[PDB]
Design a protein around this ligand. Structure first.
Ligand SMILES: [K+]
Ligand SMILES: [K+]
Ligand SMILES: [K+]
Ligand SMILES: [Mg+2]
Ligand SMILES: [Mg+2]
Ligand SMILES: [Mg+2]
Ligand SMILES: [Mg+2]
Ligand SMILES: [Mg+2]
Ligand SMILES: [Mg+2]
Ligand SMILES: [Mg+2]
Ligand SMILES: [Mg+2]
Ligand SMILES: [Mg+2]
Ligand SMILES: [Mg+2]
Ligand SMILES: [Mg+2]
Ligand SMILES: [Mg+2]
Ligand SMILES: [Mg+2]
Ligand SMILES: [Mg+2]
Ligand SMILES: [Mg+2]
Ligand SMILES: [Mg+2]
Ligand SMILES: [Mg+2]
Ligand SMILES: [Mg+2]
Ligand SMILES: [Mg+2]
Ligand SMILES: [Mg+2]
Ligand SMILES: [Mg+2]
Ligand SMILES: [Mg+2]
Ligand SMILES: [Mg+2]
Ligand SMILES: [Mg+2]
Ligand SMILES: [Mg+2]
Ligand SMILES: [Mg+2]
Ligand SMILES: [Mg+2]
Ligand SMILES: [Mg+2]
Ligand SMILES: [Mg+2]
Ligand SMILES: [Mg+2]
Ligand SMILES: [Mg+2]
Ligand SMILES: [Mg+2]
Ligand SMILES: [Mg+2]
Ligand SMILES: [Mg+2]
Ligand SMILES: [Mg+2]
Ligand SMILES: [Mg+2]
Ligand SMILES: [Mg+2]
Ligand SMILES: [Mg+2]
Ligand SMILES: [Mg+2]
Ligand SMILES: [Mg+2]
Ligand SMILES: [Mg+2]
Ligand SMILES: [Mg+2]
Ligand code: NA
Ligand code: NA
Ligand code: NA
Ligand code: NA
Ligand code: NA
Ligand code: NA
Ligand code: NA
Lengths: 50, 47, 72, 81, 255, 111
RNA sequence: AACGUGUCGCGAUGGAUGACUUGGCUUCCUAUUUCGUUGAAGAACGCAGUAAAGUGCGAUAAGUGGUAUCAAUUGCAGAACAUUCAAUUACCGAAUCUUUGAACGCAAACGGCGCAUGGGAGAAGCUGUGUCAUCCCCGUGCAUGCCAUAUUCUCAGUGUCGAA
RNA sequence: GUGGUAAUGCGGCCAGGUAACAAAUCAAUCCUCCCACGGUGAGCUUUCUUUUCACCAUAAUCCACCUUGGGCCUUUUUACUCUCGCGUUGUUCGGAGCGGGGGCUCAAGAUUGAAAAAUGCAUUGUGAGUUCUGCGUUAAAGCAAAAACCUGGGGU
RNA sequence: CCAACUGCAGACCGUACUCAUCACCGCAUCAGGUCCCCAAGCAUAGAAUGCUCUGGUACAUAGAGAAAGGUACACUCAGGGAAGUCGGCAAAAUAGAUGCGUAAGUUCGCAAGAAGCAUUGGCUCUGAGGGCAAAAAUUGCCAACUCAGAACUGCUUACGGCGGGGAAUCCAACUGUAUAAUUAAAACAUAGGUUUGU
RNA sequence: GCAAAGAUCUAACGGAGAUAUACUCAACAUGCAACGUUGGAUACUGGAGCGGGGAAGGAUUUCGUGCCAACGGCACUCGUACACGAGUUGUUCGGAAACUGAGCACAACGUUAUAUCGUUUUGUUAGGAAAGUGAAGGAACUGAAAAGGGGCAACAGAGAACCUGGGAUUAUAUUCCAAAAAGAAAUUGCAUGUGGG
RNA sequence: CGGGGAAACCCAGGUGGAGGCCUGUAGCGAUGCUGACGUGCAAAUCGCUCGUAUGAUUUGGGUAUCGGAGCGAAAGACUCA
């Protein structure tokens, strides 16, 4: 709904900002072990419940 | 924000509308007075 | 909005520094002189065409007359 | 009926986020945290759960001040001449 | 076993007074200097009902003795108290319905209510609707007045205790049959959570001494000792006698 | 094509403080507008009868504050608090009771 | 004959085994070795040219200063004092150190609201300049208790005295 | 400060009032629907159909001032003399002042105009719903409070 | 002095979208559950039920297609009519409105819609029931539907929706409550009565 | 087995998703089945709505473009999927500043080996000295009277100054619109003049 | 309000809308089919049927009382399957 405390809104904003895939140049690096973000979140799979 | 607009761009802000974006940043809609042109100020800003 | 019913009061209103502008409306029967002050829109309605004509002249130059019409 | 329908009956929330520990263990009505006992001055700590203690103890954060003062102790509070 | 219901009520919990719409405690005036040496004159401003109380209440307005201000008193109204009536309280007040006098200033045989058990009590005896005390006698040596309480017991109090002249209003209430469970529901709505009543033999033996059996029965005498611990003291508590009372009803209570 | 309306201010419950009126706009739209709460108006004391006072308006908060004073009283003594009849009663009572007191004091002095 | 059986060669599925181990576990030792109101531990939010996590850091934010070291970092980009001013590393004395939290001006599912005191900005009027009401921004102090203290602060008591 | 016989009109402290309150009935404001009439557009048109469908709108805020209902004033008050009168759909009311005449006041609406056509889309009458509002029975049930605000009583 | 202008200034946070036969809970886009507002036309007593303008939708794996045997918010059935069965379970049946009529018993309130009998379509008419104005018991204009009564003319008894009824026995007075997920009862409560303590 | 909630049909367009062929073979009998959009047809929801808005809960699912590996128990050219890029505008709307309620419990005090216990609105804390400033009077320094400390608890109670038009978005709007503010108001806080009796 | 009545009172017809009153929506429940389903749509649901539907009624939010315990119109019911 409309209401949320600004702090909850900021936590949700940070979670949105984190829900991004890995840049590919990260995969080109010398000792790289990461290929997928593995902490990706879909709003329908798992809840944050803020 | 009005005072900083005056100090940084030598322009008069007649109205500042603000919002906090869903990414967490605050965005400002700043209407200048009719004595100032937004396009000229944007050009000097480099916009 | 405020109505003014006497020409003398209309001229007192038009003499104010608050008078930003004068909008003039020609209705089929009457003519309306609307003065935009700081707080109120002041309207004098005149039923003579000649009286309205004499008013549309001789208004100060510092304030501006606006002939209101339909616009695009 | 208990079960699925009553799962549909569950509205609201007993707990929200705690300002102190951030665990979503703050009882809204009682206004106290189930995880860290906020606003009581001291935190919750029970020896029947050493695992929870090891989850929360010193060193599970960043120790931002502790590292600096530990270095200063190790260097005997050295100062310029 | 589990905690008996009668012991659960002592915790307070959901069994406390329903006082939200109550107007406040009904009291006589403070036994101040003006009431000890002269009298205070008051005006009945309103007669009001309060939830949970049969008797009517009176808002009586007095002047403050020491400040420029008005003092509003909330009293249990005697029968006949009307709005606009003057109420005299004090040592020198006349003998009339609604007036408040010390018991030593009240003639024997007079009917009184709102009676102070101790001087300055502001009224603790004969306050339920229809109730009153009867002044039996004075002892001018000991300074004590003997009176008959509504229960039928006779008690002596210091003659300095104040009483209101008359009987408490609202009398006759318990004469009308309630007729309906809903009427009992509304009656107890403004009092406390004590209704409906579940018989102990209808309970299970875990929560009541009377519980259980393949018939509903108390399997032991229901008269229990005065020394029974809580949880065991249910039934007829320290009964001197049981069964239908034949002939004179003995005055209840202690000796 | 008959219209149906929506709450336009953020409160969506039909309470006595959230009454709505249906309004047709010059744009030919049916919208909801909040109906102002009304005050019951200035009264005599409740213990005295609780009757509306002649010559006083029923003004609610802001309109009471910004209204002129004579909108809320009359020029008679106790105007705005007591009716004319209650004023007459108090005047006659003051006079008569003080007269009785002076008569009894004169009697005591003469004894 | 068709399903279906058997055996062998070759494939698939499936990830056992073996070699490999910047990890674990266990034992032993050395010390100017033991946090915090000078605000800790912990929570939270941010910070890179490109940057989700992690690491590191704090609006000086994948870092400032210093001493060594000497030619990189590196996925791309960008930069280009070398006798040491390096996005090198190592170490450490100088600095920085957002919102909190014992959290302590009052509150709090509120990035909320004060008192005192220093500042800043400041429209319209005034001679572009200064000045500036309301409004706004920043610093500092302000919890409770206890100890000490007052170049000897201000008081209270039908406590005990006592003036001249 | 001031006018009216009056109802009432106009330019520290104390005590009241608003906020502030369950139900039904009967009238109802906007608004919704319908009907009548009249415009504008569209549809059907083998044959009928003066037809069928759509639309015809006016926000807040102000000025002036033609009904309904409540309270009240003044005046007539042999008003109720032996069938008193007034009034509700309804349970009433009156010398503690009914009814009539003339006024004062409050609450709902009207009407006039400013806003406002400069906007909007491609019109001015009735009947049914509708609780804003007006009209200030169950109860051994009698149906919150405070801030804030208002007015007076005293005093400057 | 301060009551109408006028001048400047009006800070903070929320605001997308959803609120569900896909956005919440039920491991899931689950026939379950989840508070509030606005709510049209005709039939009709109507927020019953059926159909419809505005808005919305054609999303739920589909195609072909009379095996047996199923499930159904699907029917029918000669003659008999409970003989079936533990038991009329299931199904059938009754039905709206209007007039007439209605027993035992009874706490006098009821029982009662007791039981029963009859009538209702369509057309064309007649009567009654009003408001406004200028023996006014009259003169004009006008609106909203109802109820009654005739003549004529039909029925294949024909949408939806909508009680079966009676005579007795046991129990509990009654309305309520109650074993979420096998028990709704005669159990609990209840008013009423009695006792106890104070 | 993917059967409750009745249902789709037709043409054109788009699309790799076709009218897809060894010989013979005119086309049938050798490329089937399925898509999204627009138009038309047919039907359903039937205002207690697969309508239009809110709370709780969710938190980007919203919007545009693109793309169909996995997911949408069939399918997809489509998507609440995935990728990229955007989007939420307030003196007056809701909250808070700033009310009280059922209640809560900091202080105070008491208790407890232990405060992480109890009391704390029946006008009201605490053996309890809890008020810090209207005035004056010669610019901020001094001080009367006033009994019962400080908070919190309602996004449906109390309270609260704005509302229409827009050719104004891809997505927000009583929030945006620019001197003819489309415009019309109301209301705070300070200041400036005119005038007063 | 009409009729009787010496009186007390009686017999009518209207008005009015009472009730833990009845039929019946929504709502709140859950009697029967011992129907469906019973590796379900569902770890209790579906259909028809049925109880009640102005009250001891239903419901949102807030608030109070719990594990040797709470709460209970009492079923050892319920206290996050
Ligand atoms: K979950
Ligand atoms: K067939
Ligand atoms: K058939
Ligand atoms: Mg949330
Ligand atoms: Mg905003
Ligand atoms: Mg209590
Ligand atoms: Mg039992
Ligand atoms: Mg036992
Ligand atoms: Mg037993
Ligand atoms: Mg028995
Ligand atoms: Mg027995
Ligand atoms: Mg990162
Ligand atoms: Mg604290
Ligand atoms: Mg929105
Ligand atoms: Mg909804
Ligand atoms: Mg219907
Ligand atoms: Mg229906
Ligand atoms: Mg579907
Ligand atoms: Mg399916
Ligand atoms: Mg047959
Ligand atoms: Mg037959
Ligand atoms: Mg047989
Ligand atoms: Mg047989
Ligand atoms: Mg049957
Ligand atoms: Mg009989
Ligand atoms: Mg019978
Ligand atoms: Mg019949
Ligand atoms: Mg029974
Ligand atoms: Mg029973
Ligand atoms: Mg019986
Ligand atoms: Mg019932
Ligand atoms: Mg029953
Ligand atoms: Mg069961
Ligand atoms: Mg029983
Ligand atoms: Mg199969
Ligand atoms: Mg349909
Ligand atoms: Mg709907
Ligand atoms: Mg699939
Ligand atoms: Mg996505
Ligand atoms: Mg309280
Ligand atoms: Mg509060
Ligand atoms: Mg607001
Ligand atoms: Mg009933
Ligand atoms: Mg079955
Ligand atoms: Mg048992
Ligand atoms: Na919501
Ligand atoms: Na500890
Ligand atoms: Na026992
Ligand atoms: Na569902
Ligand atoms: Na199938
Ligand atoms: Na994005
Ligand atoms: Na019927």
């Amino acid at each position: 709904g409309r209401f949320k405390p600004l702090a909850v809104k900021k936590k949700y904003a940070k979670k949105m900002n984190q829900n991004k895939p890995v840049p590919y140049w990260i995969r080109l690096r010398t000792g790289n072990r990461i290929k997928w973000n593995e902490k990706r979140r879909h709003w329908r799979r798992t809840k944050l419940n803020y | 924000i009005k005072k900083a607009m005056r100090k940084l761009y030598q322009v008069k802000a007649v109205k500042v509308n603000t919002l906090i974006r869903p990414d967490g940043l605050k965005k400002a809609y700043i209407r200048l007075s009719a004595a100032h042109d937004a396009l000229d100020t944007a050009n000097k800003i480099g916009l | 909005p405020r109505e003014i019913k006497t020409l003398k009061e209309f001229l007192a209103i038009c003499s104010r520094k608050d008078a930003r502008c004068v909008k003039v409306k020609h209705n089929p029967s009457a003519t309306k002189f609307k003065v935009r002050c700081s707080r109120y829109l002041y309207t004098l309605v005149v039923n003579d065409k000649k009286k309205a004509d004499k008013i549309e002249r001789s208004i100060h130059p510092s304030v501006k007359k606006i002939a209101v019409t339909a616009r695009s | 009926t208990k079960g699925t329908t009553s799962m549909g009956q569950r509205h609201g929330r007993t707990h929200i986020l705690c300002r102190r520990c951030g665990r979503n263990s703050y009882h809204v009505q009682w206004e106290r945290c189930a995880a860290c006992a906020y606003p009581r001055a001291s935190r919750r700590r029970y020896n029947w759960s050493v695992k929870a203690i090891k989850r929360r103890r010193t060193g599970t954060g960043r120790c931002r001040y502790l590292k600096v003062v530990n270095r200063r102790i190790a260097n005997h509070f050295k100062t310029p001449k | 076993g589990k905690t008996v219901l009668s012991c659960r009520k002592g915790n307070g919990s959901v069994y406390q007074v329903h006082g939200h719409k109550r107007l406040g405690p009904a009291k006589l005036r403070i036994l101040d200097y003006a009431e000890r040496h002269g009298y205070m004159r008051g005006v009945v401003k309103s007669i009001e009902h309060e939830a949970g109380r049969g008797a009517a209440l009176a808002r009586v307005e007095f002047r403050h003795p020491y400040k420029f201000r008005r003092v509003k008193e909330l009293m249990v109204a005697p029968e006949g108290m009307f709005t606009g009536q003057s109420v005299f309280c004090g040592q020198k007040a006349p003998l009339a319905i609604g007036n408040v006098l010390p018991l030593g200033q009240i003639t024997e045989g007079c009917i009184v209510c709102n009676v102070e058990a101790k001087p300055g009590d502001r009224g603790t005896l004969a306050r339920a609707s229809g109730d009153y005390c009867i002044i039996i006698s004075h002892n001018h040596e000991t300074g004590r007045t003997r009176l008959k309480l509504p229960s039928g017991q006779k008690k002596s109090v210091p003659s300095t205790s104040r009483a209101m002249i008359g009987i408490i209003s609202g009398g006759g209430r318990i004469e009308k049959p309630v007729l309906k469970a809903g009427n009992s529901f509304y009656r107890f709505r403004g009092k406390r959570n004590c209704w409906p009543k579940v018989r102990g033999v209808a309970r299970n033996p875990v929560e009541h001494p009377h519980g259980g059996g393949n018939h509903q029965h108390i399997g032991h005498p229901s008269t229990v000792s005065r020394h029974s611990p809580p949880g065991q003291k249910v039934g007829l508590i320290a009964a001197r006698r049981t069964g239908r009372i034949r002939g004179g009803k003995a005055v209840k209570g202690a000796w | 094509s008959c219209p149906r309306v929506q709450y336009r201010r953020r409160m969506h419950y039909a309470t006595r403080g959230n009454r709505m009126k249906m309004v047709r706009t010059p744009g030919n739209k049916l919208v909801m507008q909040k109906r102002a709460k009304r005050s019951q108006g200035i009264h005599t004391p409740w213990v005295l009868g609780h009757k509306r006072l002649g010559g006083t308006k029923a003004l609610r908060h802001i309109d009471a504050r910004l209204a002129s004073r004579h909108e809320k009283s009359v020029s008679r003594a106790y105007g705005g608090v007591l009716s004319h009849d209650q004023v007459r009663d108090r005047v006659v009572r003051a006079f008569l009771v003080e007269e009785q007191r002076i008569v009894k004091q004169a009697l005591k002095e003469h004894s």
